[PDB]
């Protein structure tokens with residue numbers, strides 16, 4: 514429950530369901546290593562990506578596959594995906610919610626970080 | 629200028645053109661009195677709303693007619709309009725740009741205040 | 744549970760707690776009548792504003808008192824409040840979540856509407 | 859231009875000045891190759907990144923160094939940078955403006971594509 518991703522559809526005003534999400538962690542060699550992945554639920558939320566144990570300090574990238582989402586709705590969107598890159602757990606364990614609000618030519622993303 | 633309004637469309641990735649914008653100033657009896665208005669240009673901008681002489685300190689409301697905009701495009705909108713309420717404060721020479729980025733179920737607005 | 748308001752702080756990445764929220768409904772005479780009010784909880788959410796019975800079809804305005812919020816944190820923000828105006832229940836009862844993400848000079852608002 | 863990047867600061871309500879921006883183009887081996895870069899101007903804009911002749915169809919990544927920007931202002935940021943990944947498509951004469959509105963824990967980005 515240390516990492517949750519939530520995705521909303523700004524065109525319909527609904528959760529964005531079945532959106533693929535891939536998480537990567539920067540490795541010693543400076544490459545992006547696969548870390549976890551999943552798909553948003555009917556609530557637009559993706560829980561269970563990781564555990565407190567596995568979610569160590571590091572630089573992480575959360576890639577939200579927005580293009581596939583929009584194309585499945587008949588929209589040709591601008592972005593390939595939405596990417597969120599951040600250092601995590603540098604001051605000890607935290608809980609992170611990464612939210613993205615999606616439109617065809619735009620998105621917003623915010624993080625809520627709690628102890 | 630001392631006041632400009634800019635409106636963008638997040639669905640098509642373009643300026644929002646011909647959007648009605650109304651500006652009001654708060655009167656002593658607490659009511660909103662018409663102050664200025666117009667329609668956004670081909671660039672999505674509305675210039676020439678007021679002059680330095682007219683734009684005195686006070687509380688202003690900028691109402692952007694987002695519902696009509698979405699109606700013209702055949703897209704079902706949530707909001708009646710977008711409203712931005714702010715106090716104009718003299719603090720050296722300032723220009724206010726009110727920008728709004730529109731989606732059918734969401735909008736973002738920011739103020740850019742520069743000398 | 745037909746109306747919920749959620750407010751997030753984009754400066755700290757946390758829920759916006761104890762934020763005053765006032766809801767109004769447009770009356771026959773075209774004036775804004777008080778409808779409900781409350782303050783966000785530790786989760787940044789405001790539940791229990793109304794009931795399915797009281798929340799009839801109409802035009803509603805949700806005013807989020809952002810200025811008071813920011814001033815309590817030592818910030819002099821741009822907006823007086825964030826206003827969200829929308830027609831509700833025109834096609835029958837729905838559940839509405841109105842979210843606002845706050846920064847000193849900017850905000851975004853989105854609605855998630857479910858049946 | 860065919861490509862412009864604009865960055866705004868939602869905390870102070872101003873252009874984000876002297877922000878580093880790097881543009882990459884996806885190569886055949888799937889790697890990101892440097893394409894163009896610069897620092898935003900006093901208007902928060904970065905012009906002259908590329909020419910029509912150089913800006914061929916392909917996948918591009920625009921990375922805005924938001925962390926350094928927030929560091930210079932003494933404000934604790936969440937993201938390492940903001941990233942915008944998109945496919946450039948020839949479809950009549952197009953100009954791309956990538957805009958980003960920055961907060962310490964959130965950002966919004968939109969594309970404005972015009973002839």
Ligand SMILES: O=[N+]([O-])c1ccc(O)c([N+](=O)[O-])c1
Pocket residue numbers: 612613614621622623749751842843844851852853964
């Ligand atoms: O969590 N939210 O409900 C919410 C609201 C507005 C927003 O702009 C965002 N965002 O940028 O991710 C998220």
Ligand SMILES: O=[N+]([O-])c1ccc(O)c([N+](=O)[O-])c1
Pocket residue numbers: 619634636727728729736737738864866957958959966967968
């Ligand atoms: O440039 N702008 O005017 C502007 C306004 C609001 C926004 O949310 C954005 N954005 O997403 O980058 C840009």
